Amino acid sequence: GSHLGDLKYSLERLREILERLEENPSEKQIVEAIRAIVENNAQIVEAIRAIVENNAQIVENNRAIIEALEAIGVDQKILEEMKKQLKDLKRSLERG
Amino acid sequence: GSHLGDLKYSLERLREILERLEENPSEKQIVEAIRAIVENNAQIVEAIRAIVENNAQIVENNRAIIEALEAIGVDQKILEEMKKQLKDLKRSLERG
Amino acid sequence: GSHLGDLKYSLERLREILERLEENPSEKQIVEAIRAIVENNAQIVEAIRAIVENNAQIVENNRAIIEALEAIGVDQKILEEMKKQLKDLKRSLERG
Q1: Residue of C nearest to A30 (CA)
Q2: What is the rounded distance in angstroms from the CA atom of residue C88 to the CA atom of residue C83?
Q3: How many folded domains does chain C comprise?
């Protein structure tokens, strides 16, 4: 997926590059700035993506909990409303 | 919200641009690199944002579960501690 | 953590810079574009990171719910499977 540590570290290094860029604008600093940004973007995208997939599992887990609740005689008046929310919520997480 | 597929695809294309930039630095490649980054950033931000809103729903769903649990006589000793966590957790997700 | 409002706002401003860059490419617009991107990246990373930590709390909360469910005599046949999922899910959220 993605390593948050490396991303955050790289971000601070990106800041360092920016400061050097602004102090002395140059083609070198521009390219190096872009490089660091692109490398960060790779981790940025994956960490966003992986979270969504994880969220889908969380929502699916919640659905399993709803079953567990119903199993031991929880009023459907409560559960059914969560079922509506969980269904639509999951939909908003999945892609295809 | 955001389309993870298009973002990831665009990311790989951004990498392609970077490689071309480094091999032959130019104003063209710099601008095109920035363009792709900015377009990615649009999806990056929204996918981050949308997740937080979705998380708020998940936490709210958990609160509904707590009610369902209490309804059928779960010891408050357990539920009350989750209520504390869910309250603060939700707070950290909301903005305004 | 991160302020979604400021990030989204800054994103739209970044777009504005891009449009100016493309219309009239220049060292100034390039540096300013990078600056805005880097500043966004700071918020982008943190909002990604903070979510993962929040997700860990959500999964931990789900584990607490499992206990609450078991407390009042939910069939382990259901709970144990969630325990397996929650354990691995948490693992995928934590870093170190």
Answers
A1: C31
A2: 9
A3: 1
